[PDB]
């Protein structure tokens, strides 16, 4: 069952990003805090939509896609990925990682249903690395 | 209106990109038509210094994020 | 049986040569078209008399004679020429090639009677090569610069035209065109080609790259 | 037996390209007209040599090669290509498509002898698509 | 009249040769006297630059076509 | 000191690369840390024209020799 | 038994490379001289370490690897390579060519023991080609003009140097040199070459003709 | 067995030609010195490539060809040439003199194998006369 | 004395050639040394206009008569 | 037996050439008059030495040599030349025509001894044509 993040925490994090900036160690610590439980693509996408401005959000979408593509290359380079399965029918496509696959587009409940925990942690680590890249790039 | 957005003579590029992406995504366009429109608005708006900077790109930029990164790298510091 | 070429086609070809010139690729294509069936010496001679002026016609007669002489040297160097025969009595003299032999002077019917198909195709190829020589002779790449106001496609057209219509070997045109794109083509495009993350190894690829990344103005 | 295209039609088409340009719908209609019967590589090559200038001709050679390479990739991806055969001995190489194979270089008669009708129509469609690309690129 | 034909100061050589050969072949001369007359008119008409170009020919030119080819090869591009 | 080496405004690139590789290999770094340091010093030193030349590399350069070859190919002749 | 190259010859070659550069014909001749006997990977590696600077040495390592890889592709394309054997157990791996195989790393004696003469000559030719590539890379013909005050032999020297030390095929240098003599080489010499009663079909003949008939000044 | 000339002697001769010029009697004496043993076409060709500039090298190639052609005319005028043999199968072609014959192109070892001593001395004398001509012509 | 003969600034070329050939043939030279001396005196005397006229001879002139004919053909009428 | 031409006639002809020029019809008639009997190379050579200036004499020597060479080409093209004989031992060399052969150099008596009448008339016609050429060339 999907539970959304508190809008109070999200508002506090957005104001933190607004006053301290993207690169302060306190901001990265707060992001790591709100990045503790494995989030669904819907959660991370809406979170970055709210806390980041338009241009940093575009940059972050780009960087997240690139990092997810590196993850999928490593996944096709190793059939023992915690997102993959043993047979070929469990291979994870980027539509399933970005939340674009069938039964997931716009629906967080179905998303949480079909996604694997390894998928969730890989998406989360990818999003964190992308946030770091964009923060280092913006300023 | 997205088609009326110009980069002011004194405005920075990240502010212009923010305003343009905001107005394009918060509009009546289909979701599959936002990225090409944002790119072609970066190319035709964004006063002729950045226009020529994007035009003379040895690589082909096929995403608003890539265009923003390229312009932020090679922009005229002033 | 001899059938003459249509004077309508000949008139159209003559006007083509008159407006486009001798060296245009459309003119050479039209000549190749009217040079499709093997022609008798009478046909080619009258054709060149009509389409060419007096001085180009003199030049063409000279060049045709020289090429036919080269053909006859190759023929005496190989008894298996499609114009020759196996015995010595079928050896082909230049009087038979130029239409000057006995029973042929001024008579196209007798010409078509005694001539061989190999003779006809050899005469035709010789006449085509002679036309090419005279066209190259009747009418400088290293002096071509891209003007300050000229576009790049016009400069590329002019340069490729002057390089391909010159005295260079066929295997030396592409490197010369590339190195002229790099050193001519005023320093904005020079730097645009210099800072190419990929290696461009063909004039078409250079043209495509420059057209993509050119400064719209 | 190979029959050449009329130089009168070719001259009219060249003047059409000269006055109207490469991208006008009348020019594309005229090209489609002269692209009606399946042409041999010799025919299309000489046609583009005559109607196009030097730089558009270079661009068109590039684009034609790329499109023919895509066709050959689809052909090795499906052994039922109208240019291919059933056995491996009928596989069509790019030397046979561009007219560079043995018994074809410079000779249109031999070309017409060895080429397949599927080969001809594939070459023709490839050349038409390449012309469209170059026309969209030149202006 | 063939004997009144001169190469103009600004005229090219192929035009002069065309005009001269036309006027000589369309005249009252015998057929066996046209080539020598055309040659000797190339040598004495055809203003002194081309006159000296034909005079200093290391080879002997014995045909109007050969003279035309030689002059077209070694002519002063201008 | 390797971390203080900059490419001078008038210095060529091969001299800068020679000086940098000399100072990096003749230093206290482990042997397995010289190539990444040389690459990242090529990218951040080597005044912004070559910086942008290396940045806009359609291929990924993963060796000092490859970076040197690429820069020598596409450098601004001056 | 392995014998090292003299450090005196190596010092002289290093100073030659230091003063004349990498691309001078004297330097390439000296390298060919010290590349006479088939060298072991150790010898060539140390030689290039000593005579080349750090950055040219990196470039040369890259180029040597690429050329050796081409050699190994040709070797797997032909089982009759003088480095290969008849059975599959003699196939030569790049670890054996670069001296990285077992029993060879750092030991020139063992290297000389296990290596084949065909292996040695292939390694040597590969290293020579790599040196040529790097020399051509470390340091434009179509931009060369004869200055208003420059003599013709200096212009010819500069032009032939820039054309032969370029990326053109070997069969395209003479026509390019001729056509550059004709279009460059300021209009006095241009007209001198144009009005040549003989046909000049070689750069040497053009140079001789121009030197004979040049305007002494 | 072929032995190359010392690059030290060649460097000294090149610097002599660079400082004294082509026509000084000391330079001609040095050339005669390095022209003592009969050289293979490879040796003389590389020697003139190194000691002479580009334009003098072109002139020297021309002059060497002309002198070798005179030698071959004298050889066909006398079947007792030290380069020729008694039968017609030993007649020496210019491809064998210039090093262009089969088994010689680029290979000095094979060159030294197939060449005659009379061939070598004729090539050497021809090259010396050509050097004299070019030196008299350059200045 | 033959080696002191110069073509005067106003003198024609046939007079200079007559004087030079007279002084060379009526001197103490061997008979086999007169033609080369006459040629080399035509080339070095005979004031620089004719010197350049002889220098730029597309053909090789190997006889005093041929040099005289060439110069008389291509001389500057004045 | 050789008889020299009168110096009075030669002086009158020289003054005629001096006043009327080389090309006047009276001068050519006078030359034809003094060219009536077949002259030996000595006679014609001295005659042209006396009547012509230095530069016209050089031109005339050139033209006479060229015309004699044409005559010798026609002679080797026809063994029935009045200067030639039937066997190969009577073939006439240019040394015999120009008076340079053995037993003739400087001696007019020996010249008249060994020369043929056909040789004399050929030399005379050649000299007359050369005089015509030089006269047409001088003015």
Q: Which among B35, B38, B33, B31 is positioned nearest to B5, based on CA atoms?
A: B38
Contact between residue I45 and residue I6 where contact means Cβ atoms under 8 Å apart: yes
Give the long-range contacts of residues D67-72, CB within 8 A, separation 24 or more: D67/D126, D67/D127, D67/D129, D67/D130, D67/D133, D68/D94, D68/D97, D68/D98, D68/D123, D68/D126, D69/D94, D71/D97, D71/D122, D71/D126, D72/D97
Q: Which among C19, H138, G198, G66 is positioned nearest to D15, based on CA atoms?
A: C19
Neighbours of chain G (3+ CB pairs under 8 A): C, E, F, H, I
G22: left (phi over 0), alpha (psi -120 to 50) or beta: alpha
Experimental method: cryo-EM
Q: Which residues contact D8 (CB under 8 A, 6 or more apart)?
A: C12
Q: Which residues contact C138 (CB under 8 A, 6 or more apart)?
A: C22, C23, C56, C59, E14, E72
CATH superfamily assigned to domain C141-213:
Retrovirus capsid C-terminal domain (1.10.1200.30)
Contact between residue C11 and residue C30 where contact means Cβ atoms under 8 Å apart: no
Number of CB atoms found within 10 A of residue J56's CB? 23
Give the number of C-alpha atoms closer than 13 A to the C-alpha of residue D48, restricted to the C-beta side: 26
Sign of CA dihedral G43, G48, G50, G54: negative
Dihedral (C-alpha) D48, D52, D53, D54: value to the nearest 10 degrees?
-30
Q: How far is G153 from chain H (nearest CA, A)?
A: 6
Q: Measure the CA–CA gap between A84 and A118, rounded to whole angstroms.
A: 8
Q: Give residue for tokens 């350059």.
A: H138
SS3 A86: coil
CATH superfamily assigned to domain E2-74:
Retrovirus capsid C-terminal domain (1.10.1200.30)
SS3 C82: coil
In chain H the first and final C-alpha atoms are separated, in Å, by 38
Nearest CA in chain C to E67: C59
Contact between residue A54 and residue B22 where contact means Cβ atoms under 8 Å apart: yes
Q: How many residues does chain G have?
A: 217
> What's the gap between Cα H91 and its chain centre?
19
Give the long-range contacts of residues C87-94, CB within 8 A, separation 24 or more: C92/C116, C92/C119, C94/C68, C94/C69
At D136, list the tokens: 């969209």
What burial letters (b/e) apply to I3-28, b meaning 16+ CB within 10 Å?
eebebeeeeebbebbbbbbebbbeee
SS3 C12: helix
Q: Measure the CA–CA gap between J2 and J106, rounded to whole angstroms.
A: 13
Q: Which residues contact I41 (CB under 8 A, 6 or more apart)?
A: I2, I3, I5, I20, I24
CA dist list (Å): G59 to G55, G100, J103: 6, 19, 81
Resolution for this experimental structure (Å): 6.7
CA angle centred on E76, ends E73 and E77, rounded to 5°: 90
Number of CB atoms found within 10 A of residue A73's CB? 10
H74: left (phi over 0), alpha (psi -120 to 50) or beta: alpha
At C61, list the tokens: 């007669």
CA dist list (Å): J9 to C100, C179, H61, J36, J108: 58, 77, 61, 13, 20
Asked if G141 lies within 8 A of C179 by C-beta distance, the reply is yes
Contact between residue B60 and residue C212 where contact means Cβ atoms under 8 Å apart: yes
Q: Which among G131, G37, G3 is positioned nearest to H3, based on CA atoms?
A: G37
Contact between residue I71 and residue I13 where contact means Cβ atoms under 8 Å apart: yes
Interface test with I, best of E49, E56, E57, E76 (most I CBs within 10 A): E56
- Percent helix / strand / coil, chain G, rounded to 5: 65, 0, 35
Q: What is the DSSP string of G6-70?
A: PHHHHHHHHHHHHHH-SS-HHHHHHHHHHTSSPPPHHHHHHHHHHHS-HHHHHHHHHHHHHHHHH
Asked if C171 lies within 8 A of G172 by C-beta distance, the reply is yes
For chain G, which residues lie within 8 Å of any Cβ of chain C, measuring from their own Cβ?
140-143, 166-169, 171-172, 175-176, 179-180, 182-184
Interface test with B, best of F53, F55, F60 (most B CBs within 10 A): F55
Q: What is the DSSP string of F17-53?
A: HHHHHHHHHTSSS-GGGHHHHHHHHHHHSSTHHHHHH
> What's the gap between Cα H17 and its chain centre?
18
List phi, psi (to 5°) of G3.
Answer: -120, 125
List phi, psi (to 5°) of F63.
Answer: -165, 140
- What beta strand segments (E) does C113-215 contain? none
Element (H, E) at A3: none
Asked if G54 lies within 8 A of F22 by C-beta distance, the reply is yes
Q: Give residue for tokens 């690459």.
A: F39
Q: Which among G202, A41, A44 is positioned nearest to H65, based on CA atoms?
A: G202
Number of CB atoms found within 10 A of residue A105's CB? 13
Asked if B74 lies within 8 A of F52 by C-beta distance, the reply is yes
Sign of CA dihedral B37, B38, B43, B44: positive
Q: Measure the CA–CA gap between E65 and G127, rounded to whole angstroms.
A: 58
What burial letters (b/e) apply to G36-73, b meaning 16+ CB within 10 Å?
eebbbbbbbbbbbeebbbbbbbbbbbbbbbebbeebbe
Instruction: Write the burial class of residue G200 (CB in 10 Å: 0-12 exposed, 13-18 middle, 19+ buried).
Output: middle
Asked if G190 lies within 8 A of E57 by C-beta distance, the reply is no
Contact between residue A118 and residue A83 where contact means Cβ atoms under 8 Å apart: yes
Interface test with G, best of H16, H45, H55, H59 (most G CBs within 10 A): H55
Domain boundary assignment for chain J:
1-138
* Residues of B with Cβ-Cβ distance to A63 under 8 angstroms: 65
Q: Measure the CA–CA gap between H20 and H9, rounded to whole angstroms.
A: 16
Computed on alpha carbons and rounded to an integer, the radius of gyration of chain I in Å comes to 12
SS3 J91: coil
D6: left (phi over 0), alpha (psi -120 to 50) or beta: beta
Pairs of residues, one from chain E and one from chain G, whose beta carbons lie less than 8 Å apart: 19
Q: What is the DSSP letter of G107?
A: -
Q: Measure the CA–CA gap between H91 and H78, rounded to whole angstroms.
A: 11
Q: How far is C146 from chain G (nearest CA, A)?
A: 14
List phi, psi (to 5°) of J107.
Answer: -110, 110
Contact between residue D97 and residue D119 where contact means Cβ atoms under 8 Å apart: yes
Q: Which residues contact J87 (CB under 8 A, 6 or more apart)?
A: none
Q: Give residue for tokens 């001696």.
A: J107
Q: What is the DSSP letter of H88?
A: G
At F12, list the tokens: 């060529």
Q: Which residues contact H111 (CB under 8 A, 6 or more apart)?
A: H2, H40, H41, H42, H99, H104
Sign of CA dihedral G37, G43, G45, G51: negative
CA dist list (Å): G102 to A15, G83, G99, G110: 63, 17, 9, 9
Q: What is the DSSP letter of C5?
A: P
Contact between residue C200 and residue C209 where contact means Cβ atoms under 8 Å apart: yes
Contact between residue C20 and residue C117 where contact means Cβ atoms under 8 Å apart: no
Q: Give residue for tokens 């964190």.
A: A128
Q: Which among C114, C167, C135, C132 is positioned nearest to C35, based on CA atoms?
A: C132
Asked if I74 lies within 8 A of E58 by C-beta distance, the reply is no
Tell which residues of chain J come right before a gap with C–N over 2.5 A.
Answer: none
Number of CB atoms found within 10 A of residue D128's CB? 17
Q: What is the DSSP letter of C6?
A: P
Contact between residue A26 and residue A133 where contact means Cβ atoms under 8 Å apart: no
Q: What is the DSSP string of I20-67?
A: HHHHHHTSSS-GGGHHHHHHHHHHHSSTHHHHHHHHT-SSPP-SHHHH
CA angle centred on B10, ends B6 and B14, rounded to 5°: 65
Contact between residue D60 and residue D131 where contact means Cβ atoms under 8 Å apart: yes
The domain made up of C1-138 is a member of CATH 1.10.375.10? yes
Touching chains F and A? (3+ Cβ pairs < 8 A): no
* Residues of F with Cβ-Cβ distance to C197 under 8 angstroms: 56-59, 74
A105: left (phi over 0), alpha (psi -120 to 50) or beta: beta
Element (H, E) at H4: none
Q: Measure the CA–CA gap between G198 and E74, rounded to whole angstroms.
A: 9
Contact between residue C196 and residue B58 where contact means Cβ atoms under 8 Å apart: yes
CA dist list (Å): E51 to B32, E39, I74: 77, 12, 9
Q: How many residues does chain H have?
A: 139
């Amino acid at each position: 069952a999907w539970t959304p993040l508190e809008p109070k925490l999200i508002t506090r994090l957005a104001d933190t990003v607004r006053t301290k900036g993207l690169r302060s160690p306190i901001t990265m610590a707060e992001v790591e805090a709100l990045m503790s439980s494995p989030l669904l693509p819907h959660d991370v996408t809406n979170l970055m939509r709210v806390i980041l401005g338009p241009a940093p959000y575009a940059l972050w979408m780009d960087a997240w896609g690139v990092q997810l593509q590196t993850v999928i290359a490593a996944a096709t380079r190793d059939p023992r990925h915690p997102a993959n399965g043993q047979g070929r029918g469990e291979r994870t496509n980027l539509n399933r990682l970005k939340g674009l696959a069938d039964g997931m587009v716009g629906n967080p409940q179905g998303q949480a249903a079909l996604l694997r925990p390894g998928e969730l942690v890989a998406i989360t680590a990818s999003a964190l690395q992308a946030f770091r890249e964009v923060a280092r790039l913006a300023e």
